[PDB]
Amino acid sequence: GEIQWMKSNKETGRLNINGPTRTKLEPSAFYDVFEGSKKPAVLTSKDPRLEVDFEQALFSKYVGNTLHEPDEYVTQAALHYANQLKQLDINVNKMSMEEACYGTEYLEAIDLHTSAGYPYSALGVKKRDILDPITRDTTKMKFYMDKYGLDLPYSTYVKDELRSLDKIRKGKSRLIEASSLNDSVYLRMTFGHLYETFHANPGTVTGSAVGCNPDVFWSKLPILLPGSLFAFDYSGYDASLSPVWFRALEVVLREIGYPEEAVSLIEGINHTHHVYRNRTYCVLGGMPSGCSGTSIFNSMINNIIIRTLLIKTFKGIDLDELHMVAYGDDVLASYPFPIDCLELAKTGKEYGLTMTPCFNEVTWENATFLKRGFLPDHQFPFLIHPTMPMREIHESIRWTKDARNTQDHVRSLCLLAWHNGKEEYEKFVSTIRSVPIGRALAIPNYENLRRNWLELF
RNA sequence: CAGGUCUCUCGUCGA
RNA sequence: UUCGACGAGAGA
């Protein structure tokens, strides 16, 4: 992905989208008793902690484009993935606007607690001023889709969140491309049922982990991915995607029977306009993260990428012998034979992909997925714990958006940490008990946590 | 008053 | 066990 041009809003006529510059994160009741080095991200170029120029850092991720267009390897990869998807019988029909707006069983209603995007926010219209969970009315929605059309620009904002200390001085905050309500509605209408299918089917048919629950999914993976394991992460996945991957995504959607009217929306996300503050810019390539279907499309593309890199790098691959699941850029995969990932990553560079783990042999003992390790339980080794490092839980507990959430916050971290074992857990709970606010919390005991988890099977 | 698309899990109030 | 509204945490 590559920024094509960037121009004044006075020159493009776009209303300006200016978000808040101050963080909602503040030191928690446990800032003092736990060690950590993450801080809230830089949100303005004025930030004292900055050691670089902000806006060049913010946009440095768009590292250009390479292939615009499938070679035969991309093409066979896309069709193998698309053929796999056929067993799901995805309904390529349009969703009503009412379903796109207000939800179904496997499609959540549009989130009424977040911005309505360009132009509404600059105009002071909120989603809840257009959509209504009780009436379930869509005439106000249709009116505004008529008034402002489709293919509106994405409102860029900096994500308020913790980052590593390295990424503070280097202005390496992450961007949110807020979707306009109009585009959310239209991409939900045309792809709602695909979303429904992917949400109801985490696994190795969709090749997607969206909708999994690591507590029980981790024990399912060694069955789902038999044979030898490989994996990697990517440097700046969404911004590194060249248009060829969006043209492959269109082949896949075509093969499962979408009409061209639907398939060509994908070009409307491979080619995008964004409004950051007072200036407009335009990107070719690259997934706009806040867009509808972004996690699903990124995972589909990832299935295309892996297959493409398999058959271009080695002779005599049988794609039908590949198992994989992706969650965005995160990949876990298996093949009857060990796969040289250093070689794969190299091929990935020929397509603009910067892929990252030396190339250690991937084992269940060292693999990670969704930032969790894998650790067979001692009593029952056919049941696998998702392990989250204690450093990350320590970093989390030192901050708060509202002291009213301490119990929920600390409870949620307890359910993540215990998988690291009784010793590490009791040390965690004990530090929490070392401040008065810690002593007031309801904290489960490891044995209860372990028994509850054991009973899930 | 603002700051995306989502998943899971937990909690609070109901059925 | 299941379903709705709201809040939270982690992950993508």
Side-chain angles (χ1 to χ4, degrees), chain A residues 155-165 167-213:
Chain A
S155 304
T156 297
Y157 309 77
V158 190
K159 185 162 188 55
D160 188 19
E161 59 172 353
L162 294 175
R163 303 286 276 165
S164 71
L165 242 191
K167 296 164 165 185
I168 293 301
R169 65 197 214 211
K170 308 202 279 173
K172 302 177 100 157
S173 310
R174 288 196 296 176
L175 293 166
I176 283 317
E177 332 296 337
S179 178
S180 171
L181 179 55
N182 286 30
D183 292 324
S184 299
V185 160
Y186 197 54
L187 278 159
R188 278 161 63 101
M189 288 181 72
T190 94
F191 297 119
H193 292 310
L194 175 93
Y195 301 166
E196 298 180 325
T197 289
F198 267 70
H199 291 164
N201 290 283
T204 52
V205 185
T206 64
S208 163
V210 180
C212 78
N213 165 23

Side-chain angles (χ1 to χ4, degrees), chain A residues 231-234 236-259 262-314 316-348 350-357 360-364 366-381:
Chain A
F232 17 72
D233 275 339
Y234 301 72
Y237 187 76
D238 311 359
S240 75
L241 298 178
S242 303
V244 63
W245 304 121
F246 291 81
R247 311 280 160 64
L249 180 55
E250 291 164 351
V251 170
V252 172
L253 292 181
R254 235 196 312 281
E255 268 268 298
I256 66 192
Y258 277 105
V263 172
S264 64
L265 301 183
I266 304 309
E267 305 282 306
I269 81 169
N270 167 251
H271 180 113
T272 40
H273 292 221
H274 312 236
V275 171
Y276 179 41
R277 274 231 279 137
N278 74 324
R279 189 157 67 267
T280 291
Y281 59 114
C282 156
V283 178
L284 195 77
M287 185 74 54
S289 61
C291 83
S292 175
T294 181
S295 268
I296 281 158
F297 293 133
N298 264 331
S299 303
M300 295 182 57
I301 287 173
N302 215 335
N303 279 263
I304 297 165
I305 288 178
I306 288 292
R307 295 165 164 74
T308 288
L309 302 188
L310 279 172
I311 64 199
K312 170 103 137 47
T313 294
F314 324 100
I317 290 288
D318 193 344
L319 287 184
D320 293 1
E321 269 65 355
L322 164 64
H323 308 95
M324 75 177 273
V325 299
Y327 203 140
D329 66 313
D330 270 26
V331 192
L332 257 204
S334 72
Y335 200 68
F337 301 88
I339 302 290
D340 198 329
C341 287
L342 194 68
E343 312 207 307
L344 273 200
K346 204 195 181 59
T347 310
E350 313 172 359
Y351 293 95
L353 298 170
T354 294
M355 296 163 43
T356 36
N360 307 156
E361 171 66 327
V362 180
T363 86
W364 294 115
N366 63 11
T368 82
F369 191 61
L370 310 183
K371 271 257 75 198
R372 289 141 172 112
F374 297 69
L375 170 71
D377 181 82
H378 56 287
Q379 252 182 277
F380 316 95

